[PDB]
Amino acid sequence: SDRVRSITLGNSTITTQECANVVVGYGVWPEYLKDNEATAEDQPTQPDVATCRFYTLESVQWMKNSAGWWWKLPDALSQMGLFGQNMQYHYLGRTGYTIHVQCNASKFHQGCLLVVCVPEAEMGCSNLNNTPEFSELSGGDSARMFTDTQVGESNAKKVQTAVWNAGMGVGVGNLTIFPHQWINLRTNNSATLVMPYINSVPMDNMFRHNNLTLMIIPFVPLNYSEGSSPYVPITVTIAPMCAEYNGLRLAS
Amino acid sequence: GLPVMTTPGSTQFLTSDDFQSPSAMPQFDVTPEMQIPGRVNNLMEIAEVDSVVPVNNTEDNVSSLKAYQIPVQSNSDNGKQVFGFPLQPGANNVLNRTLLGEILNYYTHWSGSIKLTFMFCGSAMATGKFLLAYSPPGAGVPKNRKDAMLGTHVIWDVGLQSSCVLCVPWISQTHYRYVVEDEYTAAGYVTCWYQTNIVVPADVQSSCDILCFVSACNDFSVRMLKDTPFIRQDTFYQ
Amino acid sequence: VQLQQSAAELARPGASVKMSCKASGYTFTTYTMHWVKQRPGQGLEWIGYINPSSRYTEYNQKFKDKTTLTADKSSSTAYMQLSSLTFEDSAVYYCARRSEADRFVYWGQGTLVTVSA
Amino acid sequence: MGAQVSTQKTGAIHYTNINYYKDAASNSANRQDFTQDPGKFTEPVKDIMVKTMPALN
Amino acid sequence: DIQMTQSSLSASLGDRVTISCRASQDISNYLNWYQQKPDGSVKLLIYYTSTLHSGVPSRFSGSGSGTDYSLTINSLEQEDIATYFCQQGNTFPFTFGGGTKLEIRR
Amino acid sequence: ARVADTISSRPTNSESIPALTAAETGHTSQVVPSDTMQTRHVKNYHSRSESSIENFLCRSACVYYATYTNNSKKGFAEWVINTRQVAQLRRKLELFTYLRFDLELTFVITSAQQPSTASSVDAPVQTHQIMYVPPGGPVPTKVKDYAWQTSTNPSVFWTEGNAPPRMSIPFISIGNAYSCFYDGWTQFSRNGVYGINTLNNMGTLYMRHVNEAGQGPIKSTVRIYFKPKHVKAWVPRPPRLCQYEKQKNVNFSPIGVTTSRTDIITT
Ligand SMILES: CCCCCCCCCCCCCCCC(=O)O
Asked: Which of B61, E106, F148, F183 lies at a C-alpha separation of 20 to 30 Å from C40?
């Protein structure tokens, strides 16, 4: 049966019962940095059992009039165990991810989600002169959510959260060029993605650069008859893969 | 004193020439290359990825997410039409803005087959059968299911696998077609009809939805690059 | 490309006047259309705009309860309706098409609105 | 004297070029290196799937 | 809300004319100059501190930085007798300056 | 780069299903029209040459034009070098996230006579100088300055009437690729500026008249053309829908997905 998987990373295990296939990156698997590509001279720290395990974020409720959510990916795990503590004492770092979105329902519910992982997703502010602040761009493992209306220009420093433009000014239907997967409640139950390290430099600072953004957008909204369960949650678990750090200094 | 003689075309700036030119920074040392994932070599690899096409342009749905969902209900009569649009991937405003139609608007000629995928985003207890047809030009638009069954069609049964691919073929007199709207190189119409009804049990919502995708085959090709008409500018951006 | 306004109108104090600004030469559902008011003894004053694609209007904080903007994507027209008219609403109203950042490159020719008995 | 003799673009003939400058960033454009690897965008999947086989077992 | 202070400047034919308007706080080189003809037609002249619009003659030029800004006409002709406004684009909502009309000297 | 050709087909009655697939796996179906109907065997001579990344980008495009007036105050130009002030080159470079190319840089210089006052002007040919100041160098502040010596900065001189000047510039960067997008800040405290204005540090480009002001003012104009060579491009990206608003950032006002039609069955 091609409908069951089992992922194991560290001391955590994810089993699934009905699922699609797993989507890997742009075809490549996360590996370590080679010697003909490195630029720092000191030896990296590869703890690799303490930081490469599944970290579960908070759960969001899928309502009927729900528009979407987004997470900034090396920022949600900034207070998660020994991955958030290595990020503070070090200056550099590179990481690949594996992402497992899971949202279960019955055979009487209906809906559809698009789980897409976009690199370098720059967001645009509501006022056409300023830039969005840090608190509006990302919260610590809390979903910032889109809207179905337009945020007006009188809001000084907020994010433009019109969902059909996906916050970056492109058509939301054309977002299927990034590595993605659908959750169709007719057949699917969970979507799994593996992402390698994509950047123009071999190692980058993790506190002033969010190189990945995870977007979950309901294309066909949740619908059910009267009597079925109205509370349907969505849960995201992220695990780092093949992480290492350079430049050890004080805490910040 | 080697005797030469200059031809017409001297001291001109043709913006698509292939010449050599003296370097401004001599003996410059570039930074070495890196293995970055996801290198694109050809623009016909971007046009082979499926993108959701907004079939439901109804004057108040374009500024929402309801432009992508095709409404499907449980009827009382039989043989109705679900949707229908002509096949112009660079001029018709349905396929104009998708990932295939944004690459075709940089070029003038195009040739090849076009895929169309349909995902049934309904309940798990809902059934149904549809008729996905395509008619070459010369007649009008098919108005019945009897008139659309005489074209190139496929009957789709929903079930465990929730997708079906209608691959339109390359039927044309010429080797290429025009991206712009032309009566000489028309391409036909793509329609959809109920074969049977959508039969749902008790305590299931009867109004389902259908998403539609579009891509290209491995025989697609483009030609005669030009400038896109979608971007515009009046003053300098500052 | 040119914006062509309606003619000058006239109404009682307390009545309601509806103007028009018919656009041509460009795709109407791309750019927002703004409305500026100039009293005959002062400078120009902004009122608000309307995105014709989504029908989202945002007025200035002084004109929030008197004015109302609307559009129709078929006839390429933008309207503006004034209500509870006083004697301070006697001015000339221009419709402008906002360019790249904050620039008004195209303007209408203005309609004169006056109130009396 | 160098003189890489390549082929020309024809339908269904040789041409000659020499490099004169000492820097590699001063040559002509390539324009004749055609490569296609479309598998990393259309099938970005781990377990490969046969076309005639159903997608889900 | 930025108050854009600008009242009736007189100049003869063929001389150097200078119009200035002062902002309330720092607007950071976001100023636009418009020209209103005496029949009521408005058009954009200078869409930055100094950058001319396409189709404006070379007699017009702008300068300034920070708070004080300026507009200069180096050779005043007959068709340049109109009203000139300045407009900031740094803060919602857009505010225009008061008019400044030109008139011949004697 | 010849495209694939179609093979012959026959009527089938089997359990092999090419049409039924699953789009939920994030996988595009590789079916061909010989799998769903009866086709004849044709052979394609079509090629995919003109859709390559080299042929799509290696074309000259204007990026700026600046005007300096001879014999008047501030008779010199400057331009902080970027590629985000025009509509048609910004939309082409922003289909990919990372780019790595060379350049081929061509200027087109014109002139116009200004309304002088003295009778019988008769000017010789004009000479222009275009100096490129890297980030950190000493910049000019007037026309007759010491900074135009160009002892180390590269510069071109040009006399009117000839062919336009043209240089060629290698991949001048700190990283391994140019970045069209940058989701981050400058400071480590995550205040201050945001976006692609942090990474752009490429220099300044000055222009002036070499000749002195004889009898009549002259206003010139120089247009700047970029041309990428030896292009490598990574991580494709959907093209921009809304119109551009500013230079430094990606701000926009929302727009509909498509234009609208009257029905779902209308043709
Ligand atoms: C002949 C003297 C003048 C030389 C001027 C050299 C100009 C260097 C240009 C740098 C290219 C910048 C490309 C844009 C980068 C991006 O995509 O963000």
From this structure: E106
Secondary structure class of F91 (helix, strand, coil): helix
- Please indicate whether chains F and D are in contact, defined as at least 3 beta carbon pairs under 8 Å: yes
- Which two tokens mark C41? 């003894």
Instruction: For strands C9-11 and C111-115, give the pairing.
Output: parallel
For residue F13, CA distances in Å to B73, F10, F17, F38 come to 32, 10, 10, 13
Q: What angle do CA B47, A176, F17 make, to 5 degrees?
A: 75
Q: Give the CATH number for residue C31.
A: 2.60.40.10
Under an 8 A CB cutoff, do B235 and C99 touch? yes
In angstroms, the Cα distances linking F150 to F126, F164, F169 are 20, 21, 18
> Is the Cβ pair F254, C53 closer than 8 Å?
yes
Q: Is C96 helix (H, G, I), strand (E, B) or coil?
A: strand
d(CA C52, CA C73): 7
| DSSP E strand stretches across A17-132 | 23-24, 55-61, 69-72, 94-102, 112-118
- Rg (C-alpha) for chain F, rounded Å, is 27
Solved by what technique? cryo-EM
Question: What is the rounded CA–CA span in Å between residue F94 and residue B172?
Answer: 34
CB count, 10 Å around CB of D27? Answer: 18
Tokens 């290359």 locate to: B33
Resolution given for this structure, in angstroms: 3.3
SS3 F56: helix
Expressed as residue numbers, the domain containing C13 is 2-115
- Point out which residues pair with A209 in neighbouring strands: F184
Contact F179, F196 (CB under 8 A): yes
Chains in touch with E (3+ beta-carbon pairs under 8 Å) read A, B, C, F
Contact across the interface for A21 and F27, Cβ inside 8 Å: yes
Buried b or exposed e, range B80-116, using 16+ CB within 10 angstroms: ebbbbbbbbbbbbbbbbbbbbbbbbbbbbbbbbbbbb
Distance CA B105, CA F95 (A): 14
Q: Is any atom of ligand 1 closer than 6 Å to the C-beta of F180? A: yes
Domain locations along chain A: 5-244
Q: Which residue lies with its CA nearest to atom 3 of ligand 1? A: F132
How far does residue F226's CA lie from ligand 1's centre (Å)? 8
Angstrom distance (rounded) from CA F155 to CA B25: 11
Write down which chains contact chain A via at least 3 CB pairs under 8 A: B, C, D, E, F
Distance F203 CA to ligand 1 centre (A): 8
Question: Is the CB of residue F225 less than 8 Å from the CB of residue C23?
Answer: no
Q: Out of F22, F31, F259, whose CB is closest to B161?
A: F22
> Could you write out the three-class secondary structure of F227-251?
CCEEEEEEEECCCECCCCCCCCCCC
What residue spans define the domains of chain E?
8-103
- Number of domains forming the structure of chain F: 1
CB B167 within 8 A of CB B217: yes
**Identity of the amino acid at F55:** N
Q: What is the C-alpha separation between A197 and A32, in angstroms, rounded?
A: 10
SS3 A163: helix
Q: In angstroms, how far is CA F209 from the centroid of its own chain? A: 27
What would be the CATH architecture of the domain defined by E8-103?
Sandwich (2.60)
With 0-12 / 13-18 / 19 or more C-beta atoms within 10 angstroms meaning exposed / middle / buried, residue F150 is middle
Centre of ligand 1 to C-alpha F202, Å, is: 7
Q: Is D22 on the interface with F (CB under 8 A)?
A: no
**Cα–Cα dist D45/A27, whole Å:** 7
Residue F252 sits at the chain A interface (C-beta within 8 Å): yes
Q: What number does CATH give the domain A5-244?
A: 2.60.120.20
Note whether E75 contacts F: Cβ–Cβ < 8 A: yes
Closest CA to F82 of F249, F263, F255: F249
Interface C:D, ≥3 CB–CB pairs < 8 Å: no
Strand intervals (E) in A33-143: 55-61, 69-72, 94-102, 112-118
